[PDB]
Structure 1
């Protein structure tokens, strides 16, 4: 019982490019996201499930902004605030930060305790940001993830 999500680096100009996958499985403590990515910059990267099952760009202030088609952080319970994966009054789509090693790969799995069944995340997207995630809207909103760097649609 799993969902393999194809993830691509976002490039509204020359076209998105494959960088691997993220496999979602169920554990007795929540959904587990196991990455198998490469070609990314080393460090911690914001990692959240977004509203729409789309990784396409959107016009914003005359510019084609990468990944805006995915909408905001998935928040079906209306928490209206960014937080920790283990915080109840935070976007349900807030996952633990992704770790990209010196060699540009990410294979360390992370758990989202608030997510319980695979079908619950189908029909949405998974987003990887250029920046990190301090799990707060302070001092930077949405954890300070910044630009949408990679994305995949959850089938």
Structure 2
């Protein structure tokens, strides 16, 4: 019996949840949490892929405008580093995962290992977020890796 679980992912719209885009499997390995995606409908390329603090994917208000998945808050960051440094650096947000790789047909199938995370309990009650932009694992030149807008989200557990 592997320590494994799934998370439903939905489109993040200004008014709430859009279509189900599929799932992501989260599995404990000898090397940390393996995120095996099973998603469809995404823009080909590499997308910011992070655990955000709050167990919500609902939109929020910012400067009078509807902001998709804003209720998830920022990146999971129990060490209070206040810095986005990616999946391989202990000095930044614990919620920083490797970029989500999206195939030419808009599907995501390629597994990504986040070695800093060791058990399922560490992802429960957080939002699994997929951004429009990519992620260079830095706050420079763009904040939070350049992920920009939130466009897909799933509350884990």
TM range (shorter): over 0.9
Maintained 8 Å contact 1:80/1:90: yes
Q: How does 1:101-140 map to 2 (within 5 A)?
A: 101-140=103-142
Maintained 8 Å contact 1:24/1:33: yes
Count residues with an aligned counterpart. 155
Query: Which of 45, 48, 51 pairs up with 2:47?
Result: 45
Q: Could you tell me the TM-score, scaled by structure 2's length?
A: 0.96
Inter-partner Cα distance in structure 2 for 1:72 and 1:80:
10
Inter-partner Cα distance in structure 2 for 1:13 and 1:138:
31
Maintained 8 Å contact 1:3/1:154: no
Q: Could you tell me the TM-score, scaled by structure 1's length?
A: 0.97
Q: Which runs of 4+ in 1 moved over 6 A?
A: none
Give RMSD over aligned pairs. Answer: 1.0
Inter-partner Cα distance in structure 1 for 2:16 and 2:110:
29
Inter-partner Cα distance in structure 2 for 1:14 and 1:120:
26
Give 1:74's aligned residue.
76
Q: Which runs of 5+ in 2 are unaligned?
A: none
Shift of 1:15: 4.1
Maintained 8 Å contact 2:10/2:19: yes
Inter-partner Cα distance in structure 1 for 2:55 and 2:141:
29
Q: Which runs of 5+ in 1 are unaligned?
A: none
Inter-partner Cα distance in structure 2 for 1:147 and 1:75:
19
SS at match of 1:10: strand
Shift of 1:118: 0.4
Shift of 1:120: 1.4
**1:14/1:25 Cα in 2 relative to 1: closer, same or farther (>3 Å)?**
closer
